Design a binder for this molecule. Structure first.
Ligand code: HEM
Length: 152
């Protein structure tokens, strides 16, 4: 359980991301894809992208980034009581898209790296710790649903 102060830190910085959801989304997906090339293969839509310049030039990649960050935003703003938002996403990711939990760990790392690049002054160590806790709780809850559905 995050404290109310921890949730404040998380949502304070999230409100900043929301100034440019598209840019954040591109930066996060590109970081994910470059740091963890196996992740790019899960996306039929994007596996044609072979360079960072091509990734940055993809309007469709930017669209998916906005989709994913907008869903994450909705979950964060539920502060832990996120079960209705999280449940559909766990299902689709386990059953349809077939994303390992470990990939969700890589995605969290990419989020944190970006947030630190774009918001140093609203993302010091306390806010980093808080965000990490939030993203861990997300992954914990996703994992529990994965276990229920038999996804490994
Ligand atoms: C913060 C973590 C994540 C969020 C919030 C998120 C959110 C979303 C949302 C909202 C969609 C569209 C609705 C759906 O199908 O459920 C989606 C689709 C998708 N997600 Fe994620 N996702 C996350 C992590 C990942 C990761 C780590 C991968 C792959 C490594 C992944 C692969 C996909 C794919 C393949 C689709 C289908 C997109 C398409 O081909 O049209 N997701 N995700």
């Amino acid at each position: 359980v995050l404290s109310e102060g921890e949730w404040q830190l998380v949502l304070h910085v999230w409100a900043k991301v929301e100034a440019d959801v598209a840019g954040h989304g591109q930066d996060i997906l590109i970081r994910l894809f470059k740091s963890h090339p196996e992740t790019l293969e899960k996306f039929d839509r994007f596996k044609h992208l072979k360079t960072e310049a091509e990734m940055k030039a993809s309007e469709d990649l930017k669209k998916h980034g906005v989709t994913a960050l907008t869903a994450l935003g909705a979950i964060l703003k539920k502060k832990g009581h996120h079960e209705a938002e999280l449940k559909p996403l766990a299902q689709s990711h386990a059953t349809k898209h077939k994303i390992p939990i470990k990939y969700l760990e890589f995605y969290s790392e990419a989020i944190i790296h970006v947030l630190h690049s774009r918001h140093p002054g609203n993302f010091g160590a306390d806010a980093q710790g808080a965000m990490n806790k939030a993203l861990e709780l997300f992954r914990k809850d996703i994992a529990a649903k994965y276990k229920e559905l038999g996804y490994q």
